C-alpha cells in the first residue's frame, strides 16, 4: 500500500503545509508509538497532500473536531488488524473549547484563569467564531491566524 499498520489512525487529505502544524497542535508527537508522516505527497484534486499515520492510537473526539477547522478535507481512517474498520470526515462542531485565543484584546479571557470557548457558525464565506465572554464574532480566518 503505502504504510500499513495493524491498529491505529490515519489522516489523509491534509492541505499542504498543514501536516506539520497538526503534528504539533494535536500533540501527535508526545508518543512512543511509531508515527509515519508524508509531506508534499501528490493529490489529483487540489495538488498536494500531507498524510499522518499513528500506530496503536486513535484521535480524540475533540481532536477530530479541531480538524474540521484546519483540514476540512482530511479523512480520518480507523484501522484494526490492518483493516479500515471505520472512515470519518470532520464536521464543524457548535463550540470550540480552550484551543482558540480571542482576538479581542480587551476580553477577560486573557487576564483570567478560564478556558476560551467559541460558538461555531458555518456562514457562506467563512466560519464565524463567537467569543463566549466578549460576545464579539470573528472570521475563523482571523482567529486561527498567526
Amino acid at each position: 500500500g503505502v504504510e500499513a499498520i495493524k491498529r491505529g489512525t490515519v489522516i489523509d487529505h491534509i492541505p499542504a503545509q498543514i501536516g506539520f502544524k497538526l503534528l504539533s497542535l494535536f500533540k501527535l508527537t508526545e508518543t512512543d508509538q511509531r508515527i509515519t508522516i508524508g509531506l508534499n505527497l501528490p493529490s489529483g484534486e487540489m495538488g498536494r497532500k500531507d498524510l499522518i499515520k499513528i500506530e496503536n492510537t486513535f484521535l480524540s473526539e475533540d481532536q477530530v473536531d479541531q480538524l474540521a477547522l484546519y483540514a476540512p478535507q482530511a479523512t480520518v481512517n480507523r484501522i484494526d488488524n490492518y483493516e479500515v474498520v471505520g472512515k470519518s470526515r470532520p464536521s464543524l462542531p457548535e463550540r470550540i473549547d480552550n484551543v482558540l485565543v480571542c482576538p479581542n484584546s480587551n476580553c477577560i479571557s486573557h487576564a483570567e484563569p478560564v478556558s476560551s470557548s467559541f460558538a461555531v457558525r458555518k456562514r457562506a464565506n467563512d466560519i464565524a467564531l463567537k467569543c463566549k465572554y466578549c460576545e464579539k464574532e470573528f472570521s475563523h480566518n482571523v482567529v486561527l491566524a498567526n
Partner: protein, 310 residues
C-alpha cells in the same frame, strides 16, 4: 417561581421578549405602588471596577427603596485585587459567600459572564462590561420609550454617535429587534459604526435598517432619537480622529420633528446635545435617568423573589 427568579442578567441576548415584558410590567407597578420591604434582610454587593454616577447610585438607591443593604466598592484600587494582585475569579468566589446578588461594572468585555462561573448560586447583574453589554440601561430605556410612545413595536428609532463602543446601543438594538416592525437608522462616524454581528442579526430577522450621514435626513420621521457619547476611554489611538462629536443636536434641528418624538441619551453627554435642547419638550434624557429607579427596583425584586404579588 417567576422566570427571572435567580437568573444572571448578563446580556440582552439571553432574555426573551416576555422576560423584557415582565420587567416593564413590574417597573410600571413599583412606580405607582411602592414596596419598602421586598428585599428586607438581603445584602447586595455593588462592585464598580469602572466609573459610574447614574448606574451605581440608581442601583444603590433602588436597593434601599426596597429595604435591602449594600456593601461594595466604587474603586477597585483599594480591593486586594487592586493592590495584592488577586484575580477577578478569586474576588467573585469570596464575595459570593457574603451576599445575595452582585451588581458589577467592569472595564473588560465578558467580565460579568466570567463572574457567573465563580459565584455559585448568587445572581450576577451586569452593570456594564467594557463595550459589550448594558442590559440594565436597556430595561430603563424600553420602559421610557413605552411610556412616551405607548408601544415597543412599529417604532422608527435613530441611534447616533459611537455605535461601535456603545455597550448601550448594542443592548438596545438587540432588545427592540425582539419586537415587531421596528425600523432603525444608524448615524455614526465610519470608524465608529455598529458592529457587523448586530447588523447580521437585523438582516437575519429581516429588520429594516439604514445608515445616514446626518441627523436631519431622518429628523422628520423618528419616534426616538437615541444619542450616545463618544467612548473616549475605549478608543484606540488611530481613532483619536473621532474624539470630538461629529453629530451635535441643537434646539434648532428639532423644527421638523414629529410632536411625539423624544430625545433619549444614556448620559453623560459631552457636546453632542447642546443645552438648548434641554428646554424643548423633546428633551427626555433626565426623565429617562429617573426611570432607572423603577426598572432597577423591578429587576432586583424578580431575581430575588420567587413570587411577586403586586
Amino acid at each position: 417561581a417567576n422566570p427571572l427568579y435567580q437568573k444572571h442578567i448578563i446580556s440582552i441576548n439571553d432574555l426573551s421578549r416576555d422576560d423584557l415584558n415582565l420587567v416593564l410590567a413590574t417597573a410600571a407597578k413599583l412606580k405607582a405602588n411602592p414596596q419598602p420591604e421586598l428585599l428586607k434582610h438581603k445584602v447586595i454587593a455593588s462592585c464598580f471596577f469602572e466609573a459610574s454616577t447614574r448606574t451605581r447610585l440608581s442601583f444603590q438607591t433602588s436597593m434601599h427603596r426596597l429595604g435591602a443593604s449594600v456593601v461594595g466598592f466604587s474603586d477597585s484600587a483599594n480591593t486586594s485585587l487592586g493592590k495584592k494582585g488577586e484575580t477577578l475569579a478569586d474576588t467573585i468566589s469570596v464575595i459570593s459567600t457574603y451576599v445575595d446578588a452582585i451588581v458589577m461594572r467592569h472595564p473588560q468585555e465578558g467580565a460579568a459572564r466570567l463572574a457567573t462561573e465563580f459565584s455559585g448560586n448568587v445572581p450576577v447583574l451586569n452593570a456594564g462590561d467594557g463595550s459589550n453589554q448594558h442590559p440594565t440601561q436597556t430595561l430603563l430605556d424600553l420602559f421610557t420609550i413605552q411610556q412616551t410612545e405607548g408601544r415597543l413595536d412599529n417604532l422608527h428609532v435613530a441611534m447616533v454617535g459611537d455605535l461601535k463602543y456603545g455597550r448601550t446601543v448594542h443592548s438596545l438594538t438587540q432588545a427592540l429587534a425582539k419586537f415587531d416592525g421596528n425600523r432603525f437608522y444608524f448615524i455614526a462616524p465610519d470608524a465608529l459604526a455598529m458592529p457587523e454581528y448586530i447588523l447580521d442579526m437585523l438582516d437575519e430577522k429581516g429588520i429594516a435598517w439604514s445608515l445616514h450621514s446626518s441627523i436631519e435626513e431622518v429628523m422628520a420621521e423618528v419616534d426616538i432619537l437615541y444619542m450616545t457619547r463618544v467612548q473616549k476611554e475605549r478608543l484606540d489611538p488611530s481613532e483619536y480622529a473621532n474624539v470630538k462629536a461629529q453629530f451635535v443636536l441643537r434646539a434648532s434641528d428639532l423644527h421638523n420633528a414629529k410632536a411625539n418624538m423624544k430625545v433619549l441619551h444614556p448620559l453623560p453627554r459631552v457636546d453632542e446635545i447642546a443645552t438648548d435642547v434641554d428646554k424643548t419638550p423633546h428633551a427626555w434624557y433626565f426623565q429617562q435617568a429617573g426611570n432607572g429607579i423603577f426598572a432597577r427596583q423591578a429587576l432586583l425584586a424578580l431575581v430575588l423573589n420567587r413570587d411577586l404579588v403586586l
